[PDB]
């Protein structure tokens, strides 16, 4: 994330651009995940759980789009 403040650009706008670029790069999440060691079984379990949750939520949304409350 290298944000060069252009001429006549307000500092608040430059700061918001820098924040957006950092969020898009995802450096904070990377640091947080690298803070402590995750055992490979733990990493595999987490990835599988996330995939299962995504699929189940999509199926539930598909089912709920065809019903009335």
């Amino acid at each position: 994330p290298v944000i060069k403040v252009r001429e006549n650009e307000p500092f608040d706008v430059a700061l918001r651009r820098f924040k957006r670029s950092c969020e898009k790069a995802g450096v904070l999440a990377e640091v947080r995940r690298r803070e402590f060691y995750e055992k490979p079984t733990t990493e595999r379990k987490r990835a599988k759980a996330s995939a299962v949750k995504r699929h189940a939520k999509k199926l539930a949304r598909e089912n709920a789009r065809r019903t009335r409350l």
Binding site: P1, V2, S21, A25
Partner: protein, 55 residues
């Protein structure tokens, strides 16, 4: 076929920081995404592309 010398094409598949963009974002087929990753790594080694934007 993806060429590691085709820097102009390869630059479409890297971010501003130099990271390889996911195929789920670029709409690339998986078979070609693998070739893109290999070509980008070769270009990085030959210094035709940067590893990180802090160069």
């Amino acid at each position: 076929e993806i060429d590691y010398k085709d820097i102009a094409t390869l630059k479409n598949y890297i971010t501003e920081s130099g990271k390889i963009v996911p195929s789920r974002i670029t709409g690339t087929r998986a078979k070609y995404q693998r070739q893109l990753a290999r070509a980008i790594k070769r270009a990085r080694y030959l210094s035709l592309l940067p590893y990180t934007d802090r160069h």
